[PDB]
Design a protein around this ligand. Structure first.
Ligand SMILES: *[C@@H]1O[C@H](CO)[C@@H](O[C@@H]2O[C@H](CO)[C@@H](O)[C@H](O)[C@H]2NC(C)=O)[C@H](O)[C@H]1NC(C)=O
Ligand SMILES: *[C@@H]1O[C@H](CO)[C@@H](O)[C@H](O)[C@H]1NC(C)=O
Length: 222
């Protein structure tokens, strides 16, 4: 439970460098769903963003990298900084990524369903989430269980319809980066949103199914 990925085995993964209004840079994860669109968390928003596709060791620049500018951040309009509901955001890139072995998309399957508690999912990332110092600088993956929503009852506004409750406290800190995808059976079903300051599971993930209409609304107009 904390495993290094073979380099480039998750070629849709995106590493985000976010310029904040005040100057400094912060970082999140995300995933390439179209050649010019990256999906991530609303809490990753800032003045402007740049994505790095094709990475494995994020502190070691290599030739598989493709750095692309984000021209526009589409933060979900009902995003709430207190409840953290609707913590999702699309990033339109200046140009389409070039498809390579190391860089590919993860398009959503046409048909989907509400995903219930019980199944095991996986999340890969570089640990860029919360207030705790990562962790590692290479892409790693962990397996996490979808829990009954009651397991997240301690999170004030948690809503089963909107959010996934993720990770068994009695069986599992790593949950990937803010904005990173939670994959169940090869399909992205959630986005890393938040957890306790101390990172003890479970954590809360955006339930992607709920936002598929909005995702398509953005893609359709852009
Ligand atoms: C990620 O890449 C960086 C940069 O290459 C690695 O950090 C170096 O490790 C080498 C081993 O050859 C040392 O000689 C250097 O002193 C280290 N420099 C830096 C920048 O810290 C890092 O080990 C890589 N992480 C991996 C492979 O997990
Ligand atoms: C959501 O944030 C809004 C700002 O639009 C705030 O007024 C409200 O208290 C938050 N939601 C609630 C009621 O917890």
């Amino acid at each position: 439970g904390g495993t290094e990925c073979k380099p480039h085995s998750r070629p849709y993964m995106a590493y985000l460098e976010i310029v904040t209004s005040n100057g400094p840079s912060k970082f999140c994860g995300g995933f390439l769903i179209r050649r010019n669109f990256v999906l991530t968390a609303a809490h990753c928003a800032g003045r402007s963003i740049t994505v790095t596709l094709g990475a494995h060791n994020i502190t070691e620049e290599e030739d598989t990298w493709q750095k692309l500018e984000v021209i526009k951040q589409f933060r979900h309009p009902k995003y709430n900084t207190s409840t953290l509901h609707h913590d999702i955001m699309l990033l339109k890139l200046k140009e389409k990524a070039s498809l390579t072995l190391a860089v590919g998309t993860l398009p959503f399957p046409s048909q989907f369903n509400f995903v219930p508690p019980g199944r095991m999912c996986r999340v890969a990332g570089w640990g860029r989430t919360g207030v705790l110092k990562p962790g590692s600088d290479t892409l790693q993956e962990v397996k996490l269980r979808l829990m009954d929503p009651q397991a997240c009852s301690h999170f004030r506004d948690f809503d089963h319809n909107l959010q996934l409750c993720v990770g068994n406290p009695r069986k599992t800190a790593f949950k990937g980066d803010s904005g990173g995808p939670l994959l169940c059976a090869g399909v992205a079903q959630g986005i890393v949103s938040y957890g306790r300051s101390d990172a003890k599971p479970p954590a809360v993930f955006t339930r992607i199914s709920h936002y598929r209409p909005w995702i398509n609304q953005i893609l359709q107009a852009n």
